[PDB]
Design a protein around this ligand. Structure first.
Ligand SMILES: OC[C@H]1O[C@@](CO)(O[C@H]2O[C@H](CO)[C@@H](O)[C@H](O)[C@H]2O)[C@@H](O)[C@@H]1O
Ligand SMILES: OC[C@H]1O[C@@](CO)(O[C@H]2O[C@H](CO)[C@@H](O)[C@H](O)[C@H]2O)[C@@H](O)[C@@H]1O
Ligand SMILES: OC[C@H]1O[C@@](CO)(O[C@H]2O[C@H](CO)[C@@H](O)[C@H](O)[C@H]2O)[C@@H](O)[C@@H]1O
Ligand SMILES: [Cu+2]
Ligand SMILES: [Cu+2]
Ligand SMILES: [Cu+2]
Ligand SMILES: [Cu+2]
Ligand SMILES: [Cu+2]
Ligand SMILES: [Cu+2]
Lengths: 334, 334, 334
């Protein structure tokens, strides 16, 4: 008989995050979320390569869910009849029943409601896990996201000082396994089912064909570049449900980084590159000091430049010549 | 002329650990251990794939040895005449002579006795290292284990509070390289010697055919599942002598984790997934809050589900509906 | 109008480091460095395999640059007309313009001068990054190095105690991708340009053919072994610009380790193996307790023993039988 107040959240597509408070005077609530599974063929690169995706809420990654320590998270998972497979959800933030997996298995046409208490602070992966060989396949097909469980007093630096972010972005990195035909071209399939045999043979060799942020090569570039201004403190949440990543902000730093992603631990300071362990999420905060283009990459540069894993930030403001200056422009050698 | 008291230890096969004290009032002793090398053909999967294993004491991993800071560890290594190759032992816990390697090289028919002082606390890898290209081959053939060097006052949380475990398990993860024939089937060999050429070609490509806990697919499942009860604090020691692993307790957490495995460092708290660097051991403690099945995996899920790297825990006790509850069971979508 | 004193540094080839102070009473200066790009065909292994290298100052890695927090680093980058490609430089230690990349693009025949303020302490990677698919190619061709930014008061253990090193070595690890012909032999090329197509196809498969310290198999062995004496505190700086490494000193430990490489964070103590994230540098200090040969390796032992990634230390001094002793030499089993 759990009679706490209820609060609905309207989830938003990554890399944006639904509005939330950092430090709050609210007590525990039941926070209500809904996720609807969609299986769909998507284009993942600039050459028109297709991929049989399975998603929460139609996006890779799934949306970031934000709650505070001690809240109860009540999720409605819906598997519409237009899908062909059973699905479930496992929250790394939750305790028991394989993270909820064992309580949320639903066939097409069904829905389920799980509630779990947010007893551990940090950013955590959630993903589908419908048993056996299906677990890796569903996850690398795009069925993963993250949840952020904040302390009620907001983030701190471990030395008693508040760390308040002006905005948060969620970057979900996805390793994809697209088989090639004899010619050397990527193959296309009519269904996830048909993709399965060839996709599993490739997965077991452990080398992805693509590594992408937000579902596609170039997803967070151009018009969809991340943005900030000089003086803004930005939190970047990064998740990888299956394989390690090494985030790096080219031209910046991680001023405060929780590489294991758990706010019970003090953050590390002044990082160049941090490490997100496969099956986890981490978070890094940086205060922009300079305008211009930044690239956020995994610093396996082959993955970043050749397999898809580069985002951009466009930052506005005034150039600081004390920090960096071109003393002499390119000129002929004397 | 080292005249301290002597204590013999009867080693036990993993994942169990020989009886020991955590905090102790004993002073330094000479703790005596014996390891006998066995080369043997073993079955590593459910389809009957065979593998030319080389082991300490007949198991993969080798047994966990437990001592306290300041003890002297005296190991008798025996290489019976039934073996075909020279072997040795290197302890990452020890100082000098390539970890003992340079002092323990023995041909079939010989034995040696090494003593080293346990000056550094934590869990450490030990492995065979008989020079040059043989070093990786012997290690990935199964010749590795771990030693745990406890503080005399037991483990602590870094904030002055004792951390006492009710039981400890040792999970050794092994990357195996089994070549395939033209047909696509795994190959079998009559000797380790004969396996060598094909095995080395495959090793150099860096992708394992199998990744297993305790020597075999499914070794820690079914009747040999790990066990606990709600309320029990369990320490899991995890080693990987050659390749990175990312342990994850599905349905739980790492309440206290030493991912680099060294007790001179405070543990991290509240992890979802931790990282064991190739050539190291780590340790994670969790107090079970819920009954039921848990899976302990490396959270490269392809490795976990498809290459062999999943263990189970069966936990007894009372379900806690506050922590997690199925609010509404699978029903048709309204 | 920046009128601070100027200091020139004569860079030295790795693994040596140019003379510097640890703790200093100097205030901020403009420290002046010059790097000259050389493209050249080099031999990378004992069987005579060749490789189209691109380097800073003719070495892989590029030289270590050492400054103190608050200094201004003024680098002249020179791209002589004997080179065939444009190049630039990105410092992970610097803030803005893609680490300087966006301000330092130079064609053969040109030079440029960049100045940046060293606001963050630690060891940082620098590398070429001339846009798009060229970025990984230039980096894995050898164009990377590191810079060390010291606190003005020198290193500390995080508990108020100074950590002073008696010598420092810089070990740069390079992943190389050398394609093979139909026969199975490594291919040779007349130019970097010609190597590009085949090299890029191989890079995208993510498995190196060689992994080497200081540019070549066996570079830091034999006459070029690293050296120390019992009682000496040695700092080893390790960088990897593209791919993870797991350094291990066989026979020793990391007494104090900054695995993420940033001196704003206290070091970890008593490590067996540490982890250098791709796109970063780390640093580990050890006081030698025993004489003899040590091997410093990445503890993927296949990489260490078979792909090139092993260095040696030769240490002089007196054997300590308390720490380790052969109690009984190899003898026949009774
Ligand atoms: O041209 C036939 C010849 O090509 C191979 C591939 O080398 O197979 C191709 O043709 C087969 C018959 O048309 C197809 O079944 C197959 O998918 C395709 O690779 C050989 O196996 C065959 O002898
Ligand atoms: O059928 C002969 C033909 O098959 C190949 C493989 O395509 O080799 C097979 O047969 C050889 C001769 O019997 C064996 O030595 C070899 O091990 C096996 O692969 C071809 O090389 C050969 O022309
Ligand atoms: O002997 C010709 C036969 O060999 C193949 C490889 O199996 O190609 C080799 O010879 C070609 C023609 O000389 C070369 O172009 C090629 O580089 C080499 O591999 C077959 O393709 C060909 O039928
Ligand atoms: Cu699913
Ligand atoms: Cu998971
Ligand atoms: Cu051996
Ligand atoms: Cu080792
Ligand atoms: Cu270049
Ligand atoms: Cu970089």
């Amino acid at each position: 008989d759990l009679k706490l107040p209820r609060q609905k959240v309207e989830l938003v597509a990554p890399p944006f995050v639904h509005a939330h408070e950092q430090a709050t005077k609210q007590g525990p609530k039941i926070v209500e979320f809904k996720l609807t599974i969609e299986e769909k063929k998507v284009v993942i690169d600039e050459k028109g390569t297709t991929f049989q995706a399975m998603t929460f809420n139609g996006s890779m990654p799934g949306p970031l869910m934000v709650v505070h320590e001690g809240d109860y998270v009540e999720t409605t998972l819906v598997n519409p009849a237009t899908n062909t497979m059973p699905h479930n959800i496992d929250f790394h933030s939750a305790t028991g029943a394989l993270g909820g997996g064992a309580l949320t298995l639903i066939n097409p046409g069904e829905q389920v409601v799980l509630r779990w208490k947010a007893t551990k602070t940090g950013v955590f992966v959630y993903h589908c896990a419908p048993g056996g060989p299906m677990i890796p396949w569903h996850v690398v097909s795009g069925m993963n996201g993250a949840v952020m469980v904040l302390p009620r007093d907001g983030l701190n630096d471990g030395k008693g000082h508040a760390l308040k972010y002006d905005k948060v972005y969620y970057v979900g990195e996805q390793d994809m396994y697209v088989p090639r035909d004899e010619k050397g071209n990527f193959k296309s399939y009519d269904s996830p089912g048909e993709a399965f045999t060839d996709t599993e043979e490739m997965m077991k060799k452990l080398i992805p064909s693509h590594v992408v942020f937000n579902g596609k090569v170039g997803a967070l570039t151009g018009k969809n570049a991340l943005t900030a201004n000089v003086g803004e403190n930005v939190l970047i949440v990064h998740s990888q449900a299956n394989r390690d990543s090494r985030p790096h902000l080219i031209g910046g730093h991680g001023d405060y980084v929780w590489e294991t992603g758990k706010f019970g631990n003090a953050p590390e300071v002044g990082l160049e590159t941090w490490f997100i362990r496969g099956g986890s999420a981490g978070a890094a905060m940086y205060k922009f000091m300079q305008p211009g283009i930044y690239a956020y990459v995994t610093h396996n540069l082959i993955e970043a430049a050749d397999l898809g894993a580069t985002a951009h930030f466009k930052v506005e403001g005034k150039w600081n010549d004390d920090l960096m200056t071109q003393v002499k422009a390119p000129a002929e050698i004397p």
